[PDB]
Symmetry: C3
Subunit: 599 residues, 3 copies
């Protein structure tokens, strides 16, 4: 009797009060403690050394308590700890042990999920300092770390970096560094209000699998000039990806340094997301120095169905090499994305592009092995004032990239700056189904729509089709004499081109090559013999040794004669056709022709 | 001893029974009440004034109890109330205060989520009456309402409107009216069995953000002739959207009035959903009178990867103006959708269309500013009997819309009714990669496949390519004399067209314009001079002053002569070519030619 | 006093300890038991006949306990049973009653969800035996079974089939057989480590609705030679689908027998998933013997945005018939998928294909009714050594299929083995926007890129466009004399084709048909008359009665004359053109021409 009150008021008391589910005679006879033991919260470990519960807050470092929770539940084979709603839980110190090396705060462990319903906020302790809030490595050296398996973070809660700036550019900052991560995920969480390098990294140098980020929000995660670089999510293990996320920045600096996602390993995806205020949408890249876990090929890379306002490049391709590994990038699809360059002055941020073939980090452009890339069904728009805007900026070696059924409304279709890199290009394919918009019409004085500033182009197709007039452009497509061209097909549709002085320009007359197939409009002057009847007409210039046929794009205003409808050429480089003189006399005309070579 | 039994049986008793998580010496020493206080249900507030629990049911209005729950949890900084499974909770009265003005039942509040596992059902009180079940405004005037933040509704439960009809057309009915809503969502819920205006509205006139509807079901939400209009989900704040939802109607009235989604603000999306039995798939629209919260441009509008059986129009574009605001719609992508018009009699429901450029609500067609729209990679099908079916019904001013790589199998490709609106059209682009199906072949007597009933067309491309014969159609494309045409490209591929009397028709000979680029097949009669040898042939008609070249689409059955392969023209409007007379004599032939102008 | 201790220690004790939510004076006065009664776990039913809790494990069959849980909660109108984390719950026996007939273990019931957080593992009892772990039928005969409604399985847990092989090929094995299933779903679960037929089947012969599988993982679910066939998920009710799943196999046998998904009913989808190591991506099929629940048409079938490495066919189409039902398949879209055939020897697994039109299960190829299929915006790749690789293997009757804007890099574009089936083909459309890759260049000796081994082709379009040279191929497109051709358009673009001996081959001269529209390059020898001036040239061969026009694809090396630019024909089958002799004399030349017929 007397001792019973004692048990009950004691910590063992719920262990002495019996329960049976809904008075069901078949249900287990248990104690209240057992049913309470089926869930677990931060409250169960957020206490002083006497077991008295401590209230979280500005002046309480909840780090050790959350760590004890994770360590204990890890002890029992796993489960899910709730971080309670209606409370803000401040972290005010570094973790210890193997996460020491990673500037860790909290160590994640296998099979221990966190359901974050409340808010987690970083304390001023962390101002001007590196940090990585959650860390799945168990060792300061990642090569010697064990794995993190079956760890899920989710809920409706928030993680907040307290608005503190970086202290030096050299510092790193992360939200969730899963480590060598297998079956791990972040779902539903808001990450906000910081200056960090990443919010989440999945995998480490290819080690890991089936990691995902889904329905999270990323807001204002760069805020100072000191921050050297940002990629919100870093997918660095295969069979992993990001979907249905929302990414937003408002800092000027973000527009210069910040990317939403990097995909660095095979079978990874970025889908169904919305981006605003970033410099870059996605890096898709095989880095040789991150190839230890999952081979040296990144393949099956998908970027689909995203919405974006960016200030530089939507999708950046790349590959590179190290002393002993060579990186390859192949089998990539980019489709269904709708993307625009936001309002900004020309040249005020990295050069705007839907696709960029970037050089490596040291800036080498002759190490890349990028091929079998499919860009299809996307739309891109840049405002008319943005000189530095392009469907593709092709700044490094390219072994293939195929464009079909896109809509591009910007300054250049193909661009590379002259006298910079001289890319070697193979298997660039620009199908005629790509629609070229008109927003930059009349803006293109001194400029070439496809400006082919390359070392050489082979096995490529450029099928230019305009949709409106732009008589300001210097040419539709220009190849400088420095660029070799062979086994390629280059064509300009005559629509909207009749008043153009130059349609296709080959500055080293490269269209003469044995295996070059071209067609484009030009104005030609002809003069006939004086014979009544069937009568030949010849070009006055001799620039046409390469032409296999030509046909009229002009009406004939004359009654007493007609020039030929079609032409071929002669050894001396003249065009020749058979027209008709109703009445005799030497004729002289200027006609618009479609010139054709092997097509 | 004596008093102890008293405490324990009392409401404070669980506050006196100690608990420690799994007898762990490091875990907090708590009371049972504390752990029970970590969750909260309707059961905790569904009681009489004495604290005795009340059973929900047909004759119990659970409204006040749920409201007390929400108000209390709101009190503590938020959390999640469970609406328990295995029970139906009837609502039988209006809410009070600021939701009064919105016909509100339950008021939502910030950070208070509802996990709906059971069923919520409307009582007969609400028959023939307006209602809005859940309401995030705090004020009857929305302009003076505060915000709703971080409010999520989810679970496997059901909301049921009890099958009651509208009382008058003027009435409104909604399920979740989030109000000025920021980070709010509805996930997993079934909405069923009613006659309402919307099931869910996100945002209010552009105020709000990051609102979503995901994996919900909408079933039989229109059922009477009195219901004036329905849109199941109304996205009226940016960075918001609908995905992976299911929408179904079985009412005849739904096929005339009901739309699945309206997107009314920037950066919004509708994806991965299935629709059946509706009139309309989606409205995508900038309404000037809903532009107070997020500017006057709707841009970054995405409709992707949906499945639909509808009776009218899949995607409706629009923009309009008010005295002081002008609405603009730009940067829209519609792709990957597979859509069909369900079995119905011709003209039995609003005119079937994949895309409709609709006039404003007053029916004005000269106020719209719609451009940079990309329609790609969709398929559309209407059954052969449905005269009123079209890839695009272009009923109002259009400043651009680009079609690429679609498959359209219906009655018209481009349509507008004659002598209705006279749209001004710019930058309409119909790429040759659009495939035209054959289901309506032989159904097109007296009809034009592309029936261009416009005030004028500029900077547009129509590249017609058939895939099968339809000799019933009057023409492939017809421009009435009333329609101006300039700086456009119009072409008809000869495949399947050889037996066509008319391919392209220009009723005011608009193909003669300086900047009009065309090509299409026609039959022409020619007669030659009698000269042996090289000999000219001339058209007997003089309708060809506009032709720059023509070429044969016919074989030559003759041995003693051949007509020219290619033709040009003369000032008098004749065609002329140089053929060959092996033996002399005047020749006369009818040939099928490809006529070409500046192409 | 004395009796009170008794109550409290007893199973009714929590029913005597009072609780009030957060000491709120307005909250219900309840007992602890009531709040505990709001959740329910396996622990509440995993006891001996005395109510003592039993620990799960290798030597404990948890089947009867889980079944009692489900039966009881079913009793109360539904709810969610947690299968606890940190524990493995072994199943060691068959269920009884109506699931007896289906080799059932656990019977599912309506409104009873399972939240699987721990692991469920099959005991050795099941080695070499059939089994179906979860079963929604209530009757051994499915035609007499009731329905399963509102049943959801989800969590972060695992289902594991213990690695046991099939005992005989005739046996069936499943994970979740939902039965006649309406609003049922599987979310988040890993299925692993077995030898089964399916992991999940939704619906039964068209009965059921709104069933989905989302974010699940399927790993190593085939492991022996005895397993006759595998499809991981079997969607057999409408308005149902699979998304964002991960499928992986490592068994050799899987590459020969295993498919990731079959869609067998209308309005079903397969999206956003990743596949590795399987033979097949998806079957999309109307089976007449599975048409009792939802009609005989499968329509609105979507396969979108998936990533795959497979060894046979990505998407298999089919339809078939029974004595009294005829199956139809129409309105299908396949887009945005990126797919490759994994490294393997040629012919080492079923013939690699992006699309396969397969014959029925008995192998009949004349029963199918497949039409309105849209394949767009996909990429496909097979390694260069894989002879047996194709964009489409067209092995049975086809009533339509449309390809647009794809990238195909494999051995064949269109293929069927000769002297096997002789498919009747209608409305096959291969748009010019399809890009043909170069990986198999130089591998195609004795082979035809489009090898049209059909009974007949009508209303079809093949627009061949190469992107690089392959002079190893016998032809770009070949029609054997056995194949009829009519009302079709067949064309070969001259780019990369100038050195080809054969471009298009018609072995029964089928290009002569009245309604056949073609164009392709050929080399032709001509000789002229000796006349000075305008002078005709004629082909030495008489194979050209069908040509309507031709034009030069060669330059003219000569000065004293030029051959005609364009040609027509004569009754005797010669080509004839008018060229020019500056100086007289008989000329003789070999030119590359574009031959054209009615285009
Ligand atoms: Na060079
Ligand atoms: Na007009
Ligand atoms: Na035949």
């Amino acid at each position: 009797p007397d001792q019973f009150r004692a048990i009950i008021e004691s910590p063992e008391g719920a262990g002495h009060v019996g329960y049976q589910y809904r008075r069901n005679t078949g249900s287990t006879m248990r104690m209240v403690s057992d049913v309470l033991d089926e869930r677990v919260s931060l409250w169960d470990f957020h206490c002083d050394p006497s077991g008295n519960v401590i209230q979280p807050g500005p002046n309480v470092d909840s780090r050790q308590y959350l760590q004890a929770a994770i360590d204990y539940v890890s002890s029992n084979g796993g489960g899910t700890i709730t971080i309670p709603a209606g409370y803000t839980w401040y972290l005010g110190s570094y973790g210890v042990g193997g996460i020491a090396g990673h500037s860790g705060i909290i160590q994640l462990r296998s099979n221990v999920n966190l359901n974050i319903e409340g808010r987690i906020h970083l304390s001023p302790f962390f101002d001007l300092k590196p940090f990585q809030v959650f860390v799945g490595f168990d060792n300061g050296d990642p090569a010697s770390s064990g794995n993190l398996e079956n760890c899920h973070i989710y809920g409706h809660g928030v993680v907040d970096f307290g608005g503190y700036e970086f202290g030096a550019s050299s510092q790193l900052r992360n939200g969730v560094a899963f480590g060598r991560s297998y079956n791990c995920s972040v779902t539903g969480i808001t990450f906000q209000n910081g200056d960090v390098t990443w919010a989440i990294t999945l995998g480490w140098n290819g080690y890991g699998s089936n990691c995902y980020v889904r329905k999270c929000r990323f807001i204002n995660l760069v805020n100072s000039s000191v921050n050297a670089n940002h990629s919100t999510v870093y997918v660095n293990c295969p069979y992993s990806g990001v979907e249905s996320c929302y990414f937003s920045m408002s800092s000027s600096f973000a527009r210069n340094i910040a990317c939403s996602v990097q995909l660095h390993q095979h079978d990874t995806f970025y889908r169904g997301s919305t981006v605003n205020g970033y410099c870059r949408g996605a890096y898709v890249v095989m880095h040789a120095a991150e190839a230890a876990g999952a081979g040296s090929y990144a393949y099956n890379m998908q970027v689909e169905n995203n919405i974006a306002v960016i200030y530089g490049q939507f999708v950046i391709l790349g590959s590179d090499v190290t002393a002993t590994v060579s990186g390859h990038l192949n089998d990539v699809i980019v489709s269904g994305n709708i993307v625009s360059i936001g309002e900004r002055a020309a040249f005020s941020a990295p050069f705007g592009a839907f696709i960029d073939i970037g050089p490596d980090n040291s800036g080498a452009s002759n190490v890349q092995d990028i091929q079998r890339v499919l860009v299809t069904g996307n739309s891109f728009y840049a405002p008319a004032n943005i000189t530095d805007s392009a469907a593709i900026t092709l700044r490094a070696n390219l072994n293939g990239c195929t464009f079909i059924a896109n809509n591009f409304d910007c300054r250049y279709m193909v661009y590379n700056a002259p006298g910079t890199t001289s890319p070697v290009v193979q298997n660039l394919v620009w199908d005629k189904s790509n629609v070229i918009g008109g927003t930059h019409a009349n803006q293109r004085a001194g400029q070439n729509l496809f400006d082919m500033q390359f070392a050489s182009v082979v096995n490529s197709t450029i099928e230019v089709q305009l949709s409106c007039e732009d008589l300001s452009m210097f040419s539709c497509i220009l190849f400088p004499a420095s660029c070799q061209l062979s086994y390629s097909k280059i064509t300009v549709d005559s629509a909207w081109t009749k008043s153009m002085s130059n349609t296709a320009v080959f500055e080293g007359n490269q269209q003469a090559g044995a295996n070059v197939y071209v067609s484009y409009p030009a104005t030609v002057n002809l003069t006939s013999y004086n014979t009544q009847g069937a009568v030949p007409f010849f070009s006055t210039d001799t620039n046409y040794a390469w032409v296999t046929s030509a046909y009229s794009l002009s009406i004939n205003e004359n009654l007493d004669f007609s020039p030929p409808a079609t032409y071929t050429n002669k050894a001396n480089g003249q065009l020749v056709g058979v027209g008709y003189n109703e009445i005799g006399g030497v004729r002289s005309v200027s006609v618009r022709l479609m010139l054709q070579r092997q097509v």
